[PDB]
Amino acid sequence: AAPANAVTADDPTAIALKYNQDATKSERVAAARPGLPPEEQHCANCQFMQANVGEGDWKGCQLFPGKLINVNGWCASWTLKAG
Numbered sequence: 001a002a003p004a005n006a007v008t009a010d011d012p013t014a015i016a017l018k019y020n021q022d023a024t025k026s027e028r029v030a031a032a033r034p035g036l037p038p039e040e041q042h043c044a045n046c047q048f049m050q051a052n053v054g055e056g057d058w059k060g061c062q063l064f065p066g067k068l069i070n071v072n073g074w075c076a077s078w079t080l081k082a083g
C-alpha cells in the first residue's frame with residue numbers, strides 16, 4: 001500500500017518522465033541513460049533521490065516536491081548518484 005502522497009502514474013510529470021514505482025516495469029532499457037547499465041538503474045542510485053525525505057522504501061525525489069517515490073522505482077530523469 002503506497003503512502004498517501006506517492007507519485008501516481010498519471011501525474012503529468014510521471015507521464016512525461018515515464019516514472020514507475022517499480023523499475024522492473026519501467027522504460028529504463030529504452031532510455032539508455034548514461035552512468036550505469038540500464039538494468040542497474042533505480043531511484044536509490046539516482047542523484048535526485050532524497051535520503052532524508054520519507055521513510056523506508058518511500059523517499060523523496062527533488063523533481064516531485066511534496067510527494068514520495070519508491071526507492072525501487074525509476075524515471076527518465078535518472079541521473080547517477082554522486083555519493
Ligand code: SF4
Nearest residue numbers: 043046048049061075
Ligand atoms: S529523478 Fe531519480 S529519484 Fe526521482 S523518480 Fe526519477 S529516477 Fe527516481
